[PDB]
Amino acid sequence: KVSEQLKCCSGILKEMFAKKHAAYAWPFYKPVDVEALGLHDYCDIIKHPMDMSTIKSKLEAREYRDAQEFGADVRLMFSNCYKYNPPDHEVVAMARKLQDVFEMRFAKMPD
């Protein structure tokens, strides 16, 4: 039940990682590299970084009590992107495309 919803979450994150979505999902695969040129202020702006690899690790370590906790982290990931980046930045458009995939699957999780 919660077990079933957590399995659904794993499939969702699996699809997010799939070749199908790779053209827009790739910036979200790994933590933001705060040592990269231009990101020297990232941690000043973003208090709680999150990325898909970290989410994968947390699912695998059974650190989400339920699908709502999983969803919170996925949304945190997107919101950090919307907060930090200029609203016309290509990465914001990419985030939206990936979020469309997530929201549609997450909505259709049986309950």
Author numbering: 349 to 459
What does the paper say about this structure?
Bromodomains (BRDs) are protein interaction modules that specifically recognize ε-N-lysine acetylation motifs, a key event in the reading process of epigenetic marks. The 61 BRDs in the human genome cluster into eight families based on structure/sequence similarity. Despite large sequence variations, all BRD modules share a conserved fold that comprises a left-handed bundle of four α helices (αZ, αA, αB, αC), linked by loop regions of variable length (ZA and BC loops), which line the Kac binding site and determine binding specificity. The four helices form a deep cavity that is extended by the two loop regions (ZA and BC loops), creating a largely hydrophobic Kac binding pocket.
For instance, BRD4(2) did not interact with H3 peptides singly acetylated on K4. In contrast, this domain showed strong interaction with diacetylated H3 (H3K4acK9ac) but not with the same peptide acetylated at K4 but trimethylated at K9 (H3K4acK9me3). The strongest interaction was observed using diacetylated H3K4acK9ac in combination with phosphorylation at T3. Screening against BRDs of the BET family showed that BRD4(2) interacted with most combinations of two and three acetylated lysines, whereas BRD4(1) seemed to specifically recognize multiple marks found on the H4 tail. The second BET BRDs bound to tetra-acetyl H4 peptides with about 10-fold weaker affinities, suggesting that the first BRD in BET proteins recognizes the H4 tail. In contrast, the second BRDs of BET BRDs bound either weakly (BRD2), not at all (BRD3), or promiscuously (BRD4) to histone sequences and their variants present in this array. In contrast, diacetylation had only a modest effect on binding affinities of the second BRD of BRD4. As reported for interactions with single acetylation sites in the case of the BRDs of BRD2 (Umehara et al., 2010), alanine mutants of the conserved asparagine (N140 and N443 in the first and second BRDs in BRD4) did also abolish binding of diacetylated peptides in both SPOT assays as well as in ITC. Similarly, our array and ITC studies on BRD4 showed that the first BRD of this protein has high affinity for the histone H4 tail, whereas the second BRD most likely recognizes multiply acetylated marks in histone H3.
